[PDB]
């Protein structure tokens, strides 16, 4: 057979929930086009503290970025899964959510049926939670009950290896100190605070609870669910006419280099990751004409706003060393823009306030004029009352025990305004995308940032945690100065950062009239049966990790989808 009701293109984090839940139904065929293969047996996978051993194998795509020229000019790479599970194969498994008045933005900005209300229950179907034992309830581990699922495929839970110990407790004072509490679930929908947060870990099995093991292998014996592992989807094709667009199915290239069909009755569905599923419509025919005739593609739906909106943030690390051994929980830390900046709060404001229509017009030459400056006005705009008004986290601090006497802490601002693009740079669908992200690109992404790592000096050097700490170490004091100015802290900071991993927005869910790739039932405009389910979809960064909130918009996802066949 190479007919099937649904083609879902990439077995990924998002792509497996699809093809899981269209499944449920026995007379509903569904085909998984996956590039990569099971790592079901791949140590670097399952270790439930293996994080950054899969960098570089060859299970991370390694998609390598332009040269950043707002961030002192290197090109960065921004890994992703290429693995049945995708990218949850290879992330740091942490399972947060998002700010609920974040989500209700989707409904304002005109995406209906896009709220935290709306996608809760969803966020509840995927997940089925450990509570912790008392030991890990010493150690700081909590949940509030009426926000966590006890029933769905994903395990989330905490490492049997929990335990309290001086540096957690040390962490807790010292935020509360600063006046930052510690709150039982940051996944409820109010961030802000301190947190020992859960994981994506089977902990009985003590594996890392990827999507395969979640949405897949517990149910591969599903007669009507098919694999096509280590095949890569090219484009799509199209049925006859010159109307609306109608997927007939899927070109694929096999291992041994063959190029086949697979034709869809009912829908294609793409997964591939928000690095990839914009390359499929543009190698398909669907993005701006421009770009696909010079690239020899023949337009099929003009939708010139494929791959632009690229949002991404960055990840810096700052480091101490303790007179002696540190250890006990890693935390999470979400403070607002006045935990972050205290009495310089409304002056930041008031300059980032005055740069709003700046950054607009920036944005509009980014896409060539495909977004409009009143539209990125009103989103960037959504974005400054977000984080000015409803106070929204502003930032990710991770803390935890870095071996021996060592802290580690990982930051990265939440919201920043840089948007960029990518597209393709051939229609050989081999060919490396034009990856550009524009780290830095505005004042507040690099003064937010310094900001930030400002913080997290301040916090080391506070009471009780200023007792276990002896130094910094990075930056540290010779390279950063006490009084060093903002400048040299962005310096610093573009020298020595990374992606943090979390690109959205290359087939956003907005209304097509504002520049939207998809409508709000994911389905790309232009299109009668063909939707985008994965982390293109997302109209803006969300505070949290992506997974638990790509997991929801697929479980909610797959109900229109259904809701749609019948
Ligand atoms: C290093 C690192 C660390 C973290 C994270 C990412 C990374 C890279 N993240 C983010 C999160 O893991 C990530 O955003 C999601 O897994 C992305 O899910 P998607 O479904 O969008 O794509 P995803 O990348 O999972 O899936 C796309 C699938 O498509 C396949 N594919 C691509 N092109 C194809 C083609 N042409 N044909 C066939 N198949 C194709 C890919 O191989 C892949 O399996 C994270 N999140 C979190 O919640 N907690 C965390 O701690 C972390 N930490
Ligand atoms: O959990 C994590 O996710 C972050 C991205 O989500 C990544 O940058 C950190 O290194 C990692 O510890």
Same mark, same amino acid.
């Given at each position: 057979?190479?007919?099937?009701?649904?083609?879902?293109?990439?077995?990924?984090?998002?792509?497996?929930?699809?093809?899981?839940?269209?499944?449920?139904?026995?007379?509903?065929? @569904? #085909?998984?086009?996956?590039?990569?293969?099971?790592? /079901?047996?791949?140590?670097?996978?399952?270790?439930?503290?293996? =994080?950054? #051993?899969?960098?570089?194998?060859?299970?991370?795509?390694? =998609?390598?970025?332009?040269?950043?020229?707002?961030?002192?000019?290197?090109?960065?790479?921004?890994?992703?899964?290429?693995?049945?599970?995708?990218?949850?194969?290879?992330?740091?498994?942490? =399972?947060?959510?998002?700010?609920?008045?974040?989500?209700?933005?989707?409904?304002?900005?005109?995406?209906?049926?896009?709220?935290?209300?709306?996608?809760?229950?969803?966020?509840?179907?995927?997940?089925?939670?450990?509570?912790?034992?008392?030991?890990?309830?010493?150690?700081?581990?909590?949940?509030?009950?009426?926000?966590?699922?006890?029933?769905?495929?994903?395990?989330?839970?905490?490492?049997?290896?929990?335990?309290?110990?001086?540096?957690?407790?040390?962490?807790?004072?010292? *935020?509360?100190?600063? &006046?930052?509490?510690?709150?039982?679930?940051?996944? &409820?929908?109010?961030?802000?605070? *301190?947190?020992?947060?859960?994981?994506?870990?089977?902990?009985?099995?003590?594996?890392?609870?990827?999507?395969?093991?979640?949405?897949? *292998?517990?149910?591969?014996?599903?007669?009507?669910?098919?694999?096509?592992?280590?095949?890569?989807?090219?484009?799509?094709?199209?049925?006859?006419?010159?109307?609306?667009?109608?997927?007939?199915?899927?070109?694929?290239?096999?291992?041994?280099?063959?190029?086949?069909?697979? +034709?869809?009755?009912?829908?294609?569905?793409?997964?591939?990751?928000?690095?990839?599923?914009?390359?499929?419509?543009?190698?398909?025919?669907?993005?701006?004409?421009?770009?696909?005739?010079?690239?020899?593609?023949?337009?099929?739906?003009?939708?010139?706003?494929?791959?632009?909106?690229?949002?991404?943030? /960055?990840?810096?690390?700052?480091? &101490?060393?303790?007179? &002696?051994?540190?250890?006990?929980?890693?935390?999470?830390?979400?403070?607002?823009?006045?935990?972050? /900046?205290?009495?310089?709060?409304?002056?930041?404001?008031?300059?980032?306030?005055?740069? #709003?229509?700046?950054?607009?017009?920036?944005?509009?030459?980014?896409?060539?004029?495909?977004?409009?400056?009143?539209?990125?006005?009103?989103?960037?705009?959504?974005?400054?009352?977000?984080?000015?008004?409803?106070?929204?986290?502003?930032?990710?601090?991770?803390?935890?025990?870095?071996?021996?006497?060592?802290?580690?802490?990982?930051?990265?601002?939440?919201?920043? *305004?840089?948007?960029?693009?990518? +597209?393709?740079?051939?229609?050989?669908?081999?060919?490396?995308?034009?990856?550009?992200?524009?780290?830095?690109?505005?004042?507040?992404?690099?003064?937010?940032?310094?900001?930030?790592?400002?913080?997290?000096?301040?916090?080391?050097?506070?009471?009780?945690?200023?007792?276990?700490?002896?130094?910094?170490?990075?930056?540290?004091?010779?390279?950063?100065?006490?009084?060093?100015?903002?400048?040299?802290?962005?310096?610093?900071?573009?020298?020595?950062?990374?992606?943090?991993? +979390?690109?959205?927005?290359?087939?956003?869910?907005?209304?097509?009239?504002?520049?939207?790739?998809?409508?709000?039932?994911?389905?790309? =405009?232009?299109?009668?049966?063909?939707?985008?389910?994965?982390?293109?979809?997302?109209?803006?960064? @969300?505070?949290? +990790?992506?997974?638990?909130?790509?997991?929801?918009?697929?479980?909610?996802?797959?109900?229109?989808?259904?809701?749609?066949?019948?």
């Amino acid at each position: 057979t190479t007919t099937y009701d649904y083609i879902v293109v990439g077995g990924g984090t998002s792509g497996l929930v699809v093809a899981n839940r269209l499944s449920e139904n026995p007379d509903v065929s @569904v #085909l998984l086009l996956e590039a990569g293969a099971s790592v /079901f047996n791949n140590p670097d996978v399952t270790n439930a503290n293996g =994080y950054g #051993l899969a960098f570089g194998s060859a299970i991370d795509w390694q =998609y390598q970025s332009i040269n950043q020229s707002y961030a002192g000019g290197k090109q960065q790479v921004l890994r992703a899964g290429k693995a049945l599970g995708g990218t949850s194969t290879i992330n740091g498994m942490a =399972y947060t959510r998002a700010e609920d008045v974040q989500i209700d933005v989707w409904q304002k900005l005109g995406n209906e049926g896009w709220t935290w209300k709306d996608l809760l229950p969803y966020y509840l179907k995927s997940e089925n939670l450990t509570a912790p034992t008392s030991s890990q309830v010493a150690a700081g581990a909590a949940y509030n009950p009426a926000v966590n699922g006890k029933e769905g495929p994903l395990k989330v839970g905490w490492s049997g290896s929990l335990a309290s110990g001086n540096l957690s407790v040390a962490l807790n004072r010292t *935020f509360q100190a600063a &006046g930052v509490p510690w709150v039982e679930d940051v996944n &409820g929908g109010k961030m802000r605070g *301190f947190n020992i947060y859960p994981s994506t870990l089977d902990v009985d099995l003590n594996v890392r609870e990827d999507a395969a093991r979640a949405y897949y *292998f517990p149910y591969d014996d599903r007669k009507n669910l098919h694999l096509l592992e280590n095949t890569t989807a090219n484009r799509l094709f199209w049925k006859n006419g010159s109307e609306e667009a109608i997927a007939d199915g899927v070109e694929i290239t096999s291992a041994d280099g063959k190029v086949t069909r697979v +034709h869809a009755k009912k829908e294609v569905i793409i997964s591939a990751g928000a690095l990839r599923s914009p390359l499929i419509l543009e190698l398909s025919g669907v993005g701006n004409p421009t770009i696909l005739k010079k690239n020899n593609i023949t337009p099929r739906v003009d939708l010139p706003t494929v791959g632009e909106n690229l949002q991404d943030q /960055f990840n810096n690390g700052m480091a &101490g060393e303790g007179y &002696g051994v540190l250890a006990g929980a890693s935390t999470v830390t979400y403070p607002s823009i006045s935990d972050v /900046f205290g009495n310089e709060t409304d002056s930041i404001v008031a300059s980032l306030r005055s740069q #709003l229509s700046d950054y607009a017009a920036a944005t509009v030459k980014v896409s060539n004029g495909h977004m409009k400056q009143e539209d990125l006005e009103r989103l960037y705009q959504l974005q400054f009352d977000l984080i000015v008004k409803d106070k929204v986290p502003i930032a990710e601090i991770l803390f935890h025990p870095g071996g021996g006497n060592a802290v580690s802490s990982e930051f990265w601002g939440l919201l920043p *305004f840089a948007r960029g693009n990518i +597209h393709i740079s051939s229609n050989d669908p081999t060919a490396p995308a034009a990856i550009n992200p524009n780290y830095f690109m505005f004042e507040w992404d690099g003064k937010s940032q310094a900001g930030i790592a400002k913080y997290i000096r301040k916090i080391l050097r506070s009471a009780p945690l200023n007792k276990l700490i002896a130094k910094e170490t990075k930056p540290g004091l010779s390279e950063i100065p006490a009084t060093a100015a903002d400048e040299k802290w962005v310096e610093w900071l573009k020298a020595n950062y990374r992606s943090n991993f +979390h690109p959205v927005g290359t087939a956003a869910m907005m209304p097509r009239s504002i520049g939207g790739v998809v409508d709000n039932r994911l389905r790309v =405009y232009g299109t009668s049966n063909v939707r985008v389910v994965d982390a293109s979809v997302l109209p803006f960064q @969300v505070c949290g +990790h992506l997974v638990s909130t790509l997991y929801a918009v697929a479980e909610r996802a797959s109900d229109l989808i259904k809701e749609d066949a019948k």
